[PDB]
Symmetry: C3
Subunit: 478 residues, 3 copies
């Protein structure tokens, strides 16, 4: 919490809010894998069409078989899903996510079936994008990623002359798409039908259609530029027909809300100069604060904006008692690893002010023409208008115009290395010292046990002396 | 053999696969014709983009070409018909077993590669994206040209002073786009580039829309082109090159897998658990190989995975510690738990119809017997089969449970809080510094302690003396009487 | 300096390369026309795509523009001609050196930027993939349109109400593919988007089929277009942008390389060895920098590598521990080995004709001199040169050794078993917990040995007291008797 933690060299670089998922707006798409070629054909065969159909069908066999095993067999069983999830054993061993996704799958069964009910019209229609319609109502959108390119190249008629050439252009168009499909449909998981469709997969699958579909299916105020460039869009396969080669995907757009009393701070670190060496604090690069509570929170899998971080689920990791204390101001509990600093990690601008390691890097001020030096008592030296106005950090001059407002104590036992190999070597060293301490103990024990025995002899002598003084005292005393 | 009943700790076997080794392999030769054929007549015009493309690509292939020449037409076959053993390997400088292996293969494919480049003229004259290279009614391999179909599509029937500007432009963006991708594969960084493996990813860039056709046409295997294209099975290596004709000969190889008996590759996932008053997660390898009583960490990140099989070139196993083995072998007092920030996605798992959840860290609201499932401290994880709940609700997710478990909680769980620690470097280093600090005090305390000891030795020599004199003084006083 | 007698340990030098520092960098400007030119006449027809593409590419470039403004158009130049001062940096909020460095370079190029962004119309109205930007017999750089050629092939000579739907479809997919790729480069995540660098990856997406042409045209160095495109030497930054004309001015920068006199960058590979009865591997860094007697880990993950050279903008070196340095310098008693599961691929190496192999873990069968090479426990690795074997066979691999080794240099290999341990975090923590348990017992046992020490000192104090009385009587009975 105490950002006064930048005396050490760790500077906050961002403060975003945390958004969670409340509900989701959806849309159904039918990916038409086989394009429409309705021009008459005689005395000629277009082999590429056959091959594409065969290779793609085999490629989709796992998704299909999984779909049947789950859907068309153990959950909706020759009847109509009424809301009770049954036979989840069908999934074998599944994660919470997969189980969640399976339920969503059966819940979508009725819509997927409505759309697949029109598979035939969808196939006969030549179109890159098209509204799947049933008597005055839109079920969703039907897309075919290669249709436009195909229409540009197909001959109005395919005769025995055209043949060779046509089978070639259609061939390369289909095969290129096929190849990209190969990139997305690999049979490795047990329930592939339940794997999420990423925006990258959607791009491959929908080709040049993605933009059009993105707008056509969502009415939110969010622009098509955001949906495409961010990672909010995510979909899942909800239906398949291998004969018409049509895949029904359900796309989803999250409805993000902000979680109160929670911030997600980014921490960067410049090299400090402590106890005679260039070092760098060792802390998480992204933390989450909720009052006094602090967790590590890298949103590598979340969508990040300049002022917000939207995450599917919580990815927080617990920090160590020593780490927290260090973030909460207590700098004697931090940890610094030595480093080979460079220009890029020796300084940083922070709202006009510049924080830098002037001990490791030459902070040669120009206007005041005075070379800045750094007290061995200060890890990092600040630099505002007061200390300079036109500073020059090796090959880079620039003015300074702001002013910064506002006890140090660092033990060299805080300067360690956090590297497996390095740690194991120190561990070995510590262990050898424990072994020396144990030997010292043995030596020590042996000696004390020897004194105890001499003490015994000494007592046996005191007695005899004592008794001898009692007798000699019987020739003059009682 | 790994009590899978290590599930009481929250680790669940999510997969069991067979391991497969690569006995032999089938291969085929491909000639990548880098220069498109253009037959439409040219007159009163000069397509320059073709000149540039030729120049840039020839440079980009100089390193591979030079290397290929040095090894081949220079030192390994020694420009003398190979015999059976390789000679002159010092030519490679420093090489790894994988590279030497490839070098040996290079010279072995020497004969075939020659046969193919021997037809570089015909191969180049022929306009075709894919064509069979033939000699004496035999097929030596396949000839591909990734852009041909596209070029053919755009190039006009006759190029003339009128077209020139527009034709050169389209033929240019086409060749240039290919060039860019190609420039993404051939970067000279190593000392022996001609020996670097060609991946399916590079193979795709190199062959373009031609890949599916080639894959099908090169092997007859039962495996489908879909498996071949979508798996990582296929691999290739350069074994021929003619910079003049810009034709690169490549040898593609498809393995012939075999099931190594008595071996399984198990995937291990962990849900969080509640132990000694904290939400923790067991720390173990995520993928182990098992053979008898031997367990090794087997991260097959370099292999081809199937729902039932794992196949690798060479095993990438890692040895596990005695404690970690003890743990997976069933001795839970040896496992290691790290505290974690649980979430819905990590507090339960479905295992063949029965659920396994951390009902302390999560609200397991049973719906049928309408009760809140309470998790006793002596259970880091609860099991929920039909007998405990026929209708369960887990945070907005409701489902039925109609399968019965098989009681094996015969032995109570013995777990010490010392098993709960962080396995993260930073955290480990801090702990080590604490340990060391504690030991340094002891080492100091022993040094001072070593002083109160030197004092005793003294007060003892004093006593032994005063005693020696008191004895003389007594016998003296005694002899006087 | 670095006994390669580190080879007796199975760690071998695979590459020695020179290091190179980036001195000066010759630049060049590029104007990216994000909108193609359709000159053919249009009648009664709305090419819908041109509108949509435009609305989208624009909201996409808003962040880069908005930010690029608050910086250039509002807080560094300030409605006036720059004068080498750089004020108002506070506008960047918190910014790193690389960013600040860029903000400087931005305002510095502002002049050339606006110059180009002043020939908008000439650029827009012109129809070409690659167009030289000129102003009074001078090249201000190059203007480029990634999709132009393609569009020209497609676009009909005259777009009518009959061609419409058809044309809007072809043109529309061409633009949308490009738009999609652009959606891959321009996500708004940072605070100063405009400052983020442009990679050859981003560059490729942006200029498409143009890149090879632009590159060769705007640089006259000895480096071939091939290398500039294959390596990672090229970089650029967004200097000028105009949302209305959809033109982005970019500054491509090609670095001038300068060798660091003494430094050398060595790559270390390790084969398994057989030490204290088990197969293991030495735990050293993979790439190190060596200058005289200083050694640092040098992972040039970013840098541009060549068979003989390594060029980086700034260092990425890491400090090595004393034990690691001692090991790298020949003191093998300080190295660290980890038991491993060996494989063919990691059991041997060819070093200038001579093979180095673990012949305990692998069967080193000599073919010509016909014999099986045995490796004594004392040799963690064996060296097979021509003197030992002419034709060797390492299962399936059969080759000839024609070189001789002379590195017969002798030095006793002293290796303690405490050098064989795991470097895996989980394993380290398990070991640290055991060391802790001992430290724990030692401390309790110490508590006790502190109790005796007091009790011993107690009976001593007593003895020394009884020796008082006994001493007075003997001095009394000595006088009261004379
Ligand atoms: C068309 O050609 C394909 C092979 O290219 C063949 O399998 C098919 O039988 C031919 N057409 C039919 C259905 O007869
Ligand atoms: C795919 O080929 C099969 C024959 O194997 C045929 O029944 C089916 O209609 C084809 N699908 C399409 C959409 O062409
Ligand atoms: C900061 O650490 C020191 C010792 O490491 C401790 O004495 C102090 O109490 C800690 N911070 C506070 C005041 O809680
Ligand atoms: C510590 O040293 C002893 C012998 O000196 C050894 O048995 C132990 O393995 C070493 N360290 C550990 C616990 O790894
Ligand atoms: C054809 O164009 C190339 C460059 O594009 C040029 O080098 C050559 O001179 C031209 N034709 C000739 C031989 O004049
Ligand atoms: C590529 O250019 C070279 C010389 O510039 C020429 O010899 C060669 O014929 C061209 N490509 C081919 C093999 O047609
Ligand atoms: C498990 O480990 C304990 C100590 O960690 C050991 O005493 C016990 O024998 C092991 N389990 C059994 C009974 O094999
Ligand atoms: C252990 O602590 C001692 C003093 O407390 C210190 O000298 C030593 O460097 C520490 N261990 C290591 C080598 O990190
Ligand atoms: C073309 O269509 C778009 C939307 O479909 C519309 O906004 C635009 O006004 C139309 N063309 C023009 C500029 O009139
Ligand atoms: C982009 O759209 C704007 C208005 O929507 C228009 O002024 C501009 O001409 C379009 N792009 C260009 C520069 O052609
Ligand atoms: C190598 O290490 C040993 C102990 O591990 C040490 O005694 C020796 O001095 C070191 N090498 C030399 C001779 O510097
Ligand atoms: C060492 O053991 C003691 C108790 O057995 C414990 O308090 C300490 O935390 C353990 N090691 C460390 C410093 O983590």
């Amino acid at each position: 919490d105490p950002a006064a933690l930048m005396q050490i060299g760790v500077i906050p670089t961002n403060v975003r809010q945390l958004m969670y998922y409340t509900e989701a707006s959806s849309a159904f798409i039918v990916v038409k894998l086989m394009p429409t070629i309705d021009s008459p054909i005689s005395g000629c065969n277009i082999t590429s069409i056959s091959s594409y159909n065969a290779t793609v069908t085999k490629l989709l066999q796992p998704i299909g078989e999984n779909l049947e095993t789950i859907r068309n067999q153990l959950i909706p069983t020759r009847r109509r899903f009424a809301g009770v999830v049954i036979g989840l054993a069908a999934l074998g061993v599944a994660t919470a996510a997969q189980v969640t996704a399976a339920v969503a799958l059966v819940k979508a069964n009725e819509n997927a079936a409505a759309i697949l009910n029109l598979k035939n019209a969808i196939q006969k229609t030549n179109a890159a994008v098209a509204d799947v319609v049933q008597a005055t109502q839109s079920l969703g959108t039907a897309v075919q990623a290669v249709q436009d390119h195909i229409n540009s190249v197909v001959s109005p008629a395919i005769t025995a002359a055209n043949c060779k050439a046509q089978d070639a252009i259609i061939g390369s168009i289909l095969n290129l798409y096929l190849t990209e499909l190969t990139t997305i449909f690999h049979n490795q998981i047990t329930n592939p039908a339940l794997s999420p469709i990423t925006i990258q997969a959607l791009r491959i699958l929908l080709g040049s259609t993605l933009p059009t579909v993105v707008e056509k299916s969502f009415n939110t105020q969010i622009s098509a530029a955001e949906l495409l460039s961010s990672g909010l869009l995510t979909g899942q396969i909800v239906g398949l027909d291998l004969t018409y080669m049509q895949m029904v995907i359900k796309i989803e757009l999250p409805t993000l809300t902000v979680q109160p009393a929670t911030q997600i701070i980014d921490l960067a670190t410049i090299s400090a100069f402590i106890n005679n060496q260039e070092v760098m604090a060792q802390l998480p690069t992204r933390v989450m604060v909720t009052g006094s509570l602090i967790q590590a929170y890298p949103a590598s899998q979340c969508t990040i904006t300049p002022n917000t971080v939207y995450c599917r689920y919580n990815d927080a990791q617990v920090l160590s008692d020593d780490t927290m204390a260090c973030l909460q101001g207590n700098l004697t509990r931090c940890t610094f690893s030595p480093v080979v600093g460079s220009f890029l990690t020796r300084f940083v601008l922070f709202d006009g002010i510049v924080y830098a390691n002037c001990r490791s890097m030459l902070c040669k001020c120009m206007q005041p023409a005075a070379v800045i030096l750094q007290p061995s008592s200060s890890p990092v030296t600040v630099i505002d208008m007061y200390k300079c106005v036109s500073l020059q950090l090796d090959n880079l001059r620039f003015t300074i115009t702001q002013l910064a407002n506002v006890t140090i104590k660092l033990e060299s036992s805080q300067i360690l290395s956090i590297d497996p190999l390095d740690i194991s070597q120190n561990l070995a060293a510590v262990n050898k010292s424990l072994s020396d301490a144990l030997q010292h103990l043995a030596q020590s024990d042996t000696y004390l046990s020897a004194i105890e025995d001499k003490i015994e002899e000494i007592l046996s002598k005191i007695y005899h002396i004592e008794n001898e003084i009692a007798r000699i005292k019987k020739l003059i005393g009682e």
